[PDB]
Design a protein around this ligand. Structure first.
Ligand SMILES: C=CC1=C(C)[C@@H](Cc2[nH]c(/C=C3N=C(/C=C4/NC(=O)[C@H](C)[C@H]4CC)C(C)=C/3CCC(=O)O)c(CCC(=O)O)c2C)NC1=O
Ligand SMILES: C=CC1=C(C)[C@@H](Cc2[nH]c(/C=C3N=C(/C=C4/NC(=O)[C@H](C)[C@H]4CC)C(C)=C/3CCC(=O)O)c(CCC(=O)O)c2C)NC1=O
Ligand SMILES: C=CC1=C(C)[C@@H](Cc2[nH]c(/C=C3N=C(/C=C4/NC(=O)[C@H](C)[C@H]4CC)C(C)=C/3CCC(=O)O)c(CCC(=O)O)c2C)NC1=O
Ligand SMILES: C=CC1=C(C)[C@@H](Cc2[nH]c(/C=C3N=C(/C=C4\NC(=O)[C@H](C)[C@H]4CC)C(C)=C\3CCC(=O)O)c(CCC(=O)O)c2C)NC1=O
Ligand SMILES: C=CC1=C(C)[C@@H](Cc2[nH]c(/C=C3N=C(/C=C4\NC(=O)[C@H](C)[C@H]4CC)C(C)=C\3CCC(=O)O)c(CCC(=O)O)c2C)NC1=O
Ligand SMILES: C=CC1=C(C)[C@@H](Cc2[nH]c(/C=C3N=C(/C=C4\NC(=O)[C@H](C)[C@H]4CC)C(C)=C\3CCC(=O)O)c(CCC(=O)O)c2C)NC1=O
Ligand SMILES: C=CC1=C(C)[C@@H](Cc2[nH]c(/C=C3N=C(/C=C4\NC(=O)[C@H](C)[C@H]4CC)C(C)=C\3CCC(=O)O)c(CCC(=O)O)c2C)NC1=O
Ligand SMILES: C=CC1=C(C)[C@@H](Cc2[nH]c(/C=C3N=C(/C=C4\NC(=O)[C@H](C)[C@H]4CC)C(C)=C\3CCC(=O)O)c(CCC(=O)O)c2C)NC1=O
Ligand SMILES: C=CC1=C(C)[C@@H](Cc2[nH]c(/C=C3N=C(/C=C4\NC(=O)[C@H](C)[C@H]4CC)C(C)=C\3CCC(=O)O)c(CCC(=O)O)c2C)NC1=O
Ligand SMILES: C=CC1=C(C)[C@@H](Cc2[nH]c(/C=C3N=C(/C=C4\NC(=O)[C@H](C)[C@H]4CC)C(C)=C\3CCC(=O)O)c(CCC(=O)O)c2C)NC1=O
Ligand SMILES: C=CC1=C(C)[C@@H](Cc2[nH]c(/C=C3N=C(/C=C4\NC(=O)[C@H](C)[C@H]4CC)C(C)=C\3CCC(=O)O)c(CCC(=O)O)c2C)NC1=O
Ligand SMILES: C=CC1=C(C)[C@@H](Cc2[nH]c(/C=C3N=C(/C=C4\NC(=O)[C@H](C)[C@H]4CC)C(C)=C\3CCC(=O)O)c(CCC(=O)O)c2C)NC1=O
Ligand SMILES: C=CC1=C(C)[C@@H](Cc2[nH]c(/C=C3N=C(/C=C4\NC(=O)[C@H](C)[C@H]4CC)C(C)=C\3CCC(=O)O)c(CCC(=O)O)c2C)NC1=O
Ligand SMILES: CCC1=C(C)[C@@H](CC2=N/C(=C\c3[nH]c(C[C@@H]4NC(=O)C(C)=C4CC)c(C)c3CCC(=O)O)C(CCC(=O)O)=C2C)NC1=O
Lengths: 238, 177, 164, 164, 164, 164, 177
């Protein structure tokens, strides 16, 4: 007959830009993360901002936190699998400062590379959550209030999302609470100048690619850097 | 960050100086003492859950004020948060003896440690009492004056390590106070 | 800093984890070859004025163009600062024989070396080649022990490698 | 805390949202069965000295090994603390019949129970089985009402479930 | 979606946790007042053609400016689409009497309503006031039961509240 | 895995860095005491059927409550699986005398041991105390060499430490 | 990751083989050739700036098709990635020479690496030429057959590491082929 060559369409709900392209895509973003693990350990320290555990060992239990994040980002539905492909492409334009013929010409075809750049480059500066310490009660309160809208982003309505689930078993339920409280202490523990460099670094993500055009939201960073540091506009649904 | 090898190079750094043939004969004790230092550190890390369970029980031996409800340390997650804090002095005082210097102890826990405890309501008198239990059991483990635990050793002195470990738990006792 | 203490007590904190026996094993290799590492330190402490002068005009033999005005070596006031410059490299390599790794090199004398020198019109090609003069300048059973030169020589070609 | 107030006024704040009629509906189920829930509370308030003693040596019948020196029950001073320990579990389960959910259990007496007991060489297997003695120890039309035991018994096997 | 199932089975997954008795309690309030909630649903199913026509020109009495060319109601083809528009609001409010919360409202007919209407030059002030006509348009012991109007009327003023 | 190979070739990759002489030093301590480490391995290979049976009813002497129905040792079919369970711990500790660190212990038989046992109603207090029977069960100049027991005994009290 | 001390246990763990002295003596040769194994790896890390300037200059000596513009490897940023990719393969074999095992090469480099290069457009034939220069100079560096550079050594046969490093570089080459 027509040698069944009969081919209809199908929903992959993914990148679908080649099997060879798909297995290429996780290798260089592993190399992008291992590039960026080598700027964290530029000087050969596993530096104290990266924490991935508690007091009790439990990083095999936080393996099951991160492999749940390995799994829950894999079982994303077709809207949020496809929205995160395009918002990460324009955020990779925001992640690199310069404008190239090369860097975005990986970062708009490939999305794990864009995702491991908005995670990788931004973690080896100190504009993340729980790392910049506020000075007074006034800074931490608006630091708390901008986190509430990041709850409101990832919890858009009455359903709690699948993606802030941070746990599966009873052991990792309260392990996730005591993991951050040791890491919250290790912000104000580690140094005096790198945390002083954090408050200048906190304007280096918010002023230039998050609130362009709003002077009020620009001096909110320069008056409150630690409040403008957990604003987390990289929409990773967390 | 910096072992007892390298206390004598950062002060020679400040004079544009180098480590000439007069300062490192205590270092030539310190490299000839490589296996007596090694024979103390198996004796601490073998019984590490003895020492955190001997300290917090001896702290609740002397003080039934924390076991009262509404105290600092009486309930379940709370006493679980003690065995977090009970080992972490023993965790870095190992490396104070492994490196030979408490500079690995001075930045990694002792920065901001006292002011968090008043921010968490932790009474520092029970903290300085429980670390004196941890000193008294560690000097009986590096030596041969334990109750029942009798590890195999080669004879000689290690009172030079007993003075090194006594200058360590006082340094954490001055920084949590 | 940069040593095996900066590896395993930091990675156990980066895992939020105990000092397990992976961390206790890594410092045993310090102990069996600190005697290998620390008769090399008093050599260049004993020669801290001897080999600074023999490296400067060995560099200035193969870089003899500097003595004109308008360049990096236009007077003796530059050369009085130039024996300070090789010795300040030479201070740190002595300290890396003590801490084990390249601890005092990277956070003090290596990082951002490629933002300074030709901006101050100082030639970086003479900087590695003054060091590469001293890299092969060794004799392992005669100057020091045979267990001492392999820590020394691996740090000096690293200084050309870290400027790359 | 943990109740239906901790669900719906927190989720409306987590949505940044009004107390809509999803939130107003969830507390109506408190009202129609608080009378079902709160004749169970004065039973174990009336038996707050009665069933602590009957659960200790029912546990110590099937755990009779403790009386040797070097263990968790080496003297009566341990057993004087041991009837304190089951009663401190028994205080909280009484309070969870009042708040609706397991409010005073998880943030006070459940979380981090698996970081304490065998570190203090206390057997966790005797802890659930002292509670599992009291789990089946009920008689629903005779001790309390039939609408009262299903809140009681579902909290006691939860205590074995929360230690799992 | 949005119901009490979207609260407690999602929060137990957000805690990584069992369906404990906090989650089992929250759905009991569905059961005792679903009979209160679900004789209201067949009223506006019985009046699904009756009260769409009485709300359109009650709105177009107080918004009678629309009939000029160049606006939102310039012909009957707009008004043929306009009784579709109030009924499509009216479909979803019927479904929220079934799921308990405002489940079919927010993810289908509420979110991003403030990115559509005046961009299509449709007046949002007529949209809430057509609904606010039907908000007070009730009579609780006469049309339905007294236990049925308080779910109905709380959803209609919510439609003005959700457009705010 | 977990050895000194897992320290220094991974940290040089974590620094993006050569195998420098910090990494070459750390494995020298394997070589001088592998002869100390690997006459201990054929002891518990020679006693792989001898000390499994002497540890089970030494544990079941001090845990003799298990033989009732409804518990962890209700029949011989449990005890036929129970000598499998101590031997499967005993397999891995033999392998950690070969790899140097606790390589086969943590990724295979230690991590998530506190999510399994009392969920399967297996007592964890008997698990450490069967091992703590074998921890002091040694005689260092008589069974093995004096350089062999300090690797053996430091792994057995670690098994109580890793369950903590 | 995995090495020669751990290679002999994973075939024995797969058979539950209690390891005794029938396969220890192959590791005892690895024990006795500890210092011979480290004797080769310090001649290869001491000239690693020479080899990355010797190979891709020797690769552009044999084939000038890449420096033609519109070819693969011609311009200034483009040559920076040539030394970037070329140095990192020398870092991984120097890990693999130490383990007695190319397992640490096999997972951090040798997964998927081949068709990332043709999802870029790297000619794979030029990378076989560059790795063969890096195979040929490195076997001349672990012995004394270099042109000018002779380090001081202790004499004897060391072909057993030359068969090891030649069984490593073709494993790089068959991975990118
Ligand atoms: C830390 C670095 C450091 C150095 C390099 C030396 C620098 C130096 N090395 C030599 C010592 C030397 N010894 C030799 C002899 C040798 N015989 C052989 O079989 C080999 C081929 C060769 C080993 C290089 C040679 C060629 C020199 C350099 C030339 C000279 O004598 O000045 C001398 C001359 C005085 C002496 O012999 O000690 C000096 C000042 N000092 C230092 O502190
Ligand atoms: C779901 C929404 C919904 C509605 C609102 C009605 C809409 C509606 N309500 C009424 C029924 C009505 N019944 C009354 C009588 C009343 N007597 C009193 O004591 C009160 C003051 C007042 C309660 C409003 C009035 C004022 C109306 C509206 C006017 C009318 O009769 O049309 C009628 C006329 C026929 C009838 O009586 O049923 C209609 C079409 N149908 C629907 O499906
Ligand atoms: C890897 C672990 C491992 C073991 C522990 C043994 C287990 C074991 N140990 C002993 C050997 C023993 N030898 C002694 C003698 C001693 N003399 C002294 O001066 C000391 C106080 C004491 C050292 C314990 C004692 C007390 C026992 C245990 C009791 C017994 O004989 O069975 C015996 C009896 C047969 C024999 O003597 O070998 C057995 C089966 N086998 C193993 O494979
Ligand atoms: C493994 C995958 C991989 C990539 C996709 C690229 C992308 C990339 N480039 C840089 C690093 C850089 N990227 C640029 C960017 C540019 N330079 C210009 O002149 C252009 C205008 C613009 C696009 C080419 C600059 C100037 C740096 C160095 C300073 C910096 O880190 O920003 C970094 C940070 C770490 C590093 O230095 O490598 C990364 C991940 N590099 C990689 O290693
Ligand atoms: C305290 C820290 C802080 C900031 C750094 C900014 C940044 C910022 N803006 C918005 C949210 C917003 N931000 C703006 C701001 C602007 N839109 C424009 O057209 C102008 C150019 C610009 C400044 C006037 C507007 C209009 C919204 C609401 C619409 C939206 O969600 O984007 C949000 C989400 C929730 C929120 O409102 O907080 C955040 C984090 N706002 C803050 O509260
Ligand atoms: C009222 C309750 C009460 C307790 C719970 C214990 C707890 C306890 N132990 C020690 C003191 C000690 N505790 C230990 C530890 C141990 N000893 C061993 O035999 C084991 C091997 C190991 C536990 C695993 C050591 C080595 C000492 C030092 C003196 C000694 O050897 O007993 C001290 C004194 C601390 C000090 O002097 O500063 C106290 C209070 N004693 C008490 O009075
Ligand atoms: C502690 C860390 C440390 C270093 C690694 C060196 C590196 C270094 N050298 C110079 C600065 C200099 N370094 C040199 C040296 C030379 N110029 C050449 O071309 C010759 C190759 C060589 C002499 C042998 C000179 C001549 C200057 C002065 C440049 C000037 O002032 O114009 C400076 C600028 C600040 C200063 O003047 O010190 C620095 C950071 N100096 C340090 O303090
Ligand atoms: C308010 C919350 C609360 C609880 C849930 C319990 C749980 C609990 N029990 C103990 C502590 C204890 N619990 C027990 C009880 C027993 N040991 C056994 O093996 C028997 C099964 C059982 C007796 C029937 C004993 C004997 C101690 C003392 C242990 C010791 O000091 O060595 C501790 C340590 C602090 C303390 O001494 O109180 C805690 C948190 N106690 C509390 O305060
Ligand atoms: C299922 C969800 C759903 C809704 C909530 C409504 C809301 C809604 N209405 C319109 C679209 C419209 N809605 C109206 C209705 C009116 N204009 C007015 O000013 C009056 C107040 C009112 C009549 C009583 C009209 C006239 C249009 C057509 C606008 C146009 O095509 O220009 C559109 C654009 C797509 C479309 O044409 O359907 C949407 C989303 N329609 C829906 O499908
Ligand atoms: C290779 C890694 C490995 C281990 C570390 C052990 C640990 C272990 N034991 C059991 C499972 C078991 N373990 C035991 C053993 C005991 N119960 C007791 O209370 C006594 C103290 C002890 C006997 C001396 C029993 C009886 C079961 C069966 C439980 C059941 O099926 O109900 C299981 C569940 C799967 C299985 O049945 O194997 C696991 C993972 N087994 C392993 O395969
Ligand atoms: C030409 C192809 C070729 C082969 C097929 C092997 C064949 C082979 N494998 C092993 C020997 C071995 N091979 C492996 C590896 C493995 N065991 C497993 O369980 C896995 C299936 C596999 C990859 C993980 C191990 C672990 C040993 C040593 C122990 C054993 O025999 O199990 C040996 C003995 C000597 C040696 O170690 O090299 C030989 C000749 N080698 C080759 O050159
Ligand atoms: C026309 C272009 C052209 C070049 C750029 C060079 C590059 C070059 N070098 C070697 C071959 C080699 N290259 C070196 C490396 C070095 N030798 C030294 O004296 C230094 C110590 C070190 C550089 C720092 C070594 C040791 C060999 C092996 C043979 C030899 O000793 O020369 C080969 C042969 C590779 C092979 O056989 O597969 C090539 C092409 N040769 C050329 O024909
Ligand atoms: C961590 C740093 C470190 C080093 C750099 C080496 C350095 C080194 N190589 C050899 C010693 C040796 N090395 C080799 C191997 C070689 N010899 C050659 O001439 C070739 C260049 C090369 C072939 C690969 C041989 C054959 C011996 C002789 C073994 C002996 O002397 O007993 C020895 C003598 C010890 C011995 O092997 O018995 C030492 C210290 N060892 C280390 O620990
Ligand atoms: C993919 C999910 C996942 C993991 C992660 C591991 C979980 C895990 N992380 C570890 C340990 C861990 N976690 C970090 C932190 C972080 N990670 C880095 O590679 C660098 C450079 C970091 C600093 C910011 C470091 C540095 C280590 C130490 C060992 C290492 O990864 O090199 C360890 C062992 C250390 C110990 O024995 O206590 C484990 C088991 N398993 C998993 O399933």
């Amino acid at each position: 007959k027509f040698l069944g060559t009969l081919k209809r369409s199908k929903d992959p709900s993914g990148l679908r830009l080649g099997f060879y392209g798909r297995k290429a895509d996780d290798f260089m973003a592993r190399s992008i993360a291992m590039q960026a693990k080598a700027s964290a350990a530029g000087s050969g320290v596993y530096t104290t901002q990266c924490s991935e555990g508690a007091s009790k060992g439990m990083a095999e239990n936080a393996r099951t936190a991160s492999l749940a994040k390995q799994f829950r980002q894999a079982q994303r539905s077709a809207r949020e699998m496809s929205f995160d492909y395009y918002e990460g492409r324009k955020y990779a334009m925001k992640a690199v400062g310069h404008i190239c013929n090369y860097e975005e010409k990986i970062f708009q075809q490939y999305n794990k590379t864009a995702a491991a750049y908005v995670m990788g480059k931004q973690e080896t500066l100190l504009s993340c959550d729980r790392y910049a310490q506020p000075a007074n009660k006034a800074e931490e309160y608006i630091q708390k209030s901008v986190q509430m809208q990041m709850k409101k982003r990832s919890i858009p309505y009455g359903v709690y999302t699948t993606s802030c689930a941070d746990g599966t078993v009873k052991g990792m339920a309260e392990n996730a609470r005591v993991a951050k409280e040791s890491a919250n202490f290790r912000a104000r523990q580690m140094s005096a100048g790198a945390k002083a460099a954090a408050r200048f670094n906190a304007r280096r993500v918010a002023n230039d690619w998050h609130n362009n055009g709003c002077n009020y939201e620009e001096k909110l960073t320069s008056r409150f850097p630690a409040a403008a540091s957990s604003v987390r506009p990289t929409t990773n649904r967390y | 960050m910096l072992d007892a090898f390298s206390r004598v190079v950062v002060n020679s750094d400040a004079k544009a100086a180098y480590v000439g043939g007069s300062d490192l004969q205590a270092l030539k004790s310190f490299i000839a003492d490589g296996n007596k230092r090694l024979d103390a550190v198996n004796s601490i890390v073998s019984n590490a859950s003895c020492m955190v369970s001997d300290a917090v029980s001896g702290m609740i031996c002397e003080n039934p004020g924390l076991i009262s409800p509404g105290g600092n340390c009486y309930t379940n997650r709370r006493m679980a948060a003690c065995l977090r804090d009970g080992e972490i002095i023993l965790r870095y005082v190992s490396y104070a003896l492994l490196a030979g210097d408490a500079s690995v102890l001075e930045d990694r826990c002792l920065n901001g440690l006292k002011e968090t405890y008043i921010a968490l309501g932790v009474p520092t008198n029970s903290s300085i009492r429980a670390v004196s239990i941890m000193k008294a059991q560690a000097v009986a483990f590096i030596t041969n004056t334990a109750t029942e635990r009798k590890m195999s050793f080669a004879a000689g002195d290690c009172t030079s390590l007993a003075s090194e470990v006594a200058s360590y738990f006082d340094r954490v006792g001055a920084a949590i106070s | 800093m940069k040593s095996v203490i900066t590896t395993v007590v930091s990675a156990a904190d980066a895992a939020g984890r105990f000092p397990s026996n992976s961390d206790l094993e890594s410092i045993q290799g310090n102990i069996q070859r600190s005697a290998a590492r620390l008769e090399a330190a008093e050599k260049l402490a004993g020669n801290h004025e001897a080999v600074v002068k023999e490296a400067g005009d060995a560099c200035f033999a193969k870089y003899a163009y500097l003595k004109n005005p308008g360049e990096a070596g236009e007077n003796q006031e530059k050369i009085n600062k130039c024996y300070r410059d090789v010795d300040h490299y030479m201070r740190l390599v002595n300290y890396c024989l003590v801490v084990g790794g390249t601890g005092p090199l990277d956070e003090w004398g290596i990082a951002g070396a490629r933002e300074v020198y030709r901006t101050l019109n100082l030639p970086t090609s003479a900087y590695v080649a003054s060091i590469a003069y001293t890299r092969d300048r060794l004799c392992v059973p005669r100057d020091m022990s045979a267990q001492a030169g392999v820590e020394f020589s691996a740090y000096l070609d690293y200084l050309i490698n870290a400027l790359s």
